[model samples]
Target: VEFRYADFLFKNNNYAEAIEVFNKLEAKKYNSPYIYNRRAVCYYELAKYDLAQKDIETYFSKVNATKAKSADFEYYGKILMKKGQDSLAIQQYQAAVDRDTTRLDMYGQIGSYFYNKGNFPLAIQYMEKQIRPTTTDPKVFYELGQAYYYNKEYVKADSSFVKVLELKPNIYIGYLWRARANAAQDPDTKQGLAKPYYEKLIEVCAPGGAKYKDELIEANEYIAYYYTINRDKVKADAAWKNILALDPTNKKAIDGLK
Candidate 1:
């Protein structure tokens, strides 16, 4: 209980004061992987990156990885990320998540890390676990939909996107992704099969905003392509003209014209 107060201070984000008490523990020869790990967090939070590194390295040398506490893995991951070692940090995050499957965010670190690395199987694997006690996180569901879409599992992607739309209908991401998923499922090579999803995207992505313009053009581009392939020249003409009206210089719309 010597550094019990220090532990309390650290938990409360009083890193500057926490270090003073932690130093007392060190001076008293209260050395252990646990102590070093806790002290490292204080150091890390105090902007003493090098000092934190030293302490955590000392921790790693003494602690057993397989039997290491979740704190060890989580803090180590944070340290590695601070050092700009993203891949190694994600490995530590994965270790933390694997060893402690009952919490949030740790799974997000693991899932998004794999998702960014084009490892959809593992991304889906970790993200699916993040649903935890509730299956209503639109953000996580949208992420899973992205992984499934990229992995070419259109049906699963579509299903997940439906959930995303149900939870948060205003998000343009859901509409775009759902559009692609439906298009991917278009049998007989008909393009307009995904019209409803793209129409939703167009409506929600109306102009007058900075990021909205480019995305709207892109949506119109999709609509133009779909209608052209389906031999609906009137609809295709309307789509292309919509793009040119919004952005006369847009490349796809310009080239798409006769």
Candidate 2:
């Protein structure tokens, strides 16, 4: 009855009142370990992450080993993240996945965390698992592609960016990455593997009118480099001139022309 009243207060956003009841329940060791979980969330809702962390830890320690759900682990992970415990947060997220393999978002949580921390191999490990045949999130494809690219798995990065373009044809960044991925495979620029995608990126961004200044410069630089390598001085000079047009102070274009 008191538990129900505390839950009712929690649902009504009365976190302080709920916490009071929860404190009383917690002092008695509660009715099951679930009381700790409930109190943890109340603390979380109030942005009291320190208290929330303590309650969640208590919940985990007291709960039956097999009875813990993926959501419980996820909540614990979220609290850890809020407390800036990056590595531990990832472990809890992985624990969530172990509890329930169907939690795709947990994979993404772990994947993106590793990606941001420059741990591309771990990012790829979790991201590859997240991207099943039926996955459709473009952001997932973008991060996975980035992980592959940084890991020097150019072929896989190329394929992942292709899916990025397919899912979001108008995203110029996708085309830019596709260009880079293809360029990676042909480091000498002889095959011109990245040319079409760079051109497509340029075309997509053209309507934005100076909004994509850096991307334009980068794409033009690649074209200029490709032309120069092929001994087409005229086309190379034109590409360089285009860069000069975009940014008069650009050192590469200034040096290329001279």
Candidate 1: where are CA atoms >4 Å away? 1-52, 55-72, 81-91, 98-101, 187-191, 207-209
Estimate the lDDT of model 1: 0.81
Candidate 2, residues 171-202, lDDT tens digits: the string is 99999999999999999887999999999988
Models 1 onward score TM values of 0.69, 0.72
- Candidate with top lDDT is 2
Report the poorest 10 consecutive residues by lDDT, candidate 2: 26-35
The 10 consecutive residues of candidate 1 with the worst lDDT sum are: 187-196
Compared with the true structure, all predictions reach lDDT values of 0.81, 0.90
> What is the C-alpha lDDT profile of model 1 across 123-145, one tens digit per residue?
88888877755677788888889
Q: Count of backbone clashes for each model?
A: 0, 0
